[PDB]
Amino acid sequence: DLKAFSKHIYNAYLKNFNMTKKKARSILTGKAPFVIHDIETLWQAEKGLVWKQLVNGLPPYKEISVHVFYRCQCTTVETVRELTEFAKSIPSFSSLFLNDQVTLLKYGVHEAIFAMLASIVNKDGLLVANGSGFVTREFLRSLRKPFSDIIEPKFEFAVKFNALELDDSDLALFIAAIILCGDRPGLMNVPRVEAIQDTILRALEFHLQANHPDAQYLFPKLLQKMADLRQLVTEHAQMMQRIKKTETETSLHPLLQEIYKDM
Ligand SMILES: CC(C)c1nnc(NS(=O)(=O)c2ccc(CCNC(=O)c3sc4cc(F)ccc4c3Cl)cc2)s1
Ligand SMILES: CCCCCCCCO[C@@H]1O[C@H](CO)[C@@H](O)[C@H](O)[C@H]1O
Q1: Which of 76, 84, 263 to mutate to test the pocket of ligand 2 (most atoms within 8 A of CB)?
Q2: How much distance in Å is there from the Cα of 15 to the middle of ligand 2?
């Protein structure tokens, strides 16, 4: 029964995401992306590197540390869009009141984004523009503060999370468990959410058995990663709040602006 449930969430993930850990992990290994590590290479990428969201559709250019930020902002907004469509793809989720759905997405989306970030990450950098390019970690560290400080706790996490060696069928269930969380403030029908969450967590355990049989303590380890993700997002909202006051000239997307609102 839970085999059918797991299959459905996997089909909802594959049907909804531009990049599987499978596709990403091949690109970062072999059988090539254009490495962005300085101003010259960013300009080079800006010129002839296939971005889904074009440069003309970005906020008015200000500076380098800000342009990088705006490009990142776009993908976060598009991942919020994939995740909403993935959440709706679960028929149990798309049954709750539209505001209860918005509550789960408002608080769960950033947790999910960071868990999925580990798929396109390695110790030295991350994939960009559907794997067309590869941005270096040192380049991002070389940007001005506060911008150089944003992506660092994400990388620390991503590396640790990648050690668990999860596949796309594990992530579909992991993300589902992240979205459908009863601990979200402003939830109306908490028993119904808590209900669905239980089904997912049951499904996640029995799938981790069939997919990772020799894996010691995987399920409680992922339950801890879920908690760690909650902290990383608390830390993240806090940073973007500082960026909102300090960087008055940088434009924060209202959707993300609303996510960090009462966090
Ligand atoms: C980068 C630093 C100033 C930040 N600004 N916002 C942050 N948010 S975040 O939570 O850490 C976060 C949120 C979502 C992701 C996934 C998407 N990332 C991308 O697609 C990126 S980064 C980058 C740098 C480039 F030159 C060119 C393109 C490019 C692209 Cl594309 C990563 C990090 S980090
Ligand atoms: C508080 C913010 C979190 C809410 C997430 C909203 C983002 C989802 O935006 C989605 O865009 C799609 C196509 O353009 C549509 O088909 C959907 O109806 C829509 O909800």
Answers
A1: 84
A2: 16
Distances in Å between the Cα of 152 and the Cα atoms of 109, 125, 141 are 19, 11, 8
Q: Are 260 and 240 a contacting pair, CB within 8 Å?
A: yes
Nearest ligand (C-alpha, residue 113): 1
The CATH class given to the 1-263 domain equals mainly alpha
Type and span of the H or E element at 136: strand 133-136
Distance 77 CA to ligand 2 centre (A): 10
Separation of CA 206 from chain center: 24
Distance of alpha carbon 246 from the chain centroid? 25
Contact 187, 146 (CB under 8 A): no
User: What is the residue type of 192?
Assistant: R
Method used to determine the 3D structure: X-ray
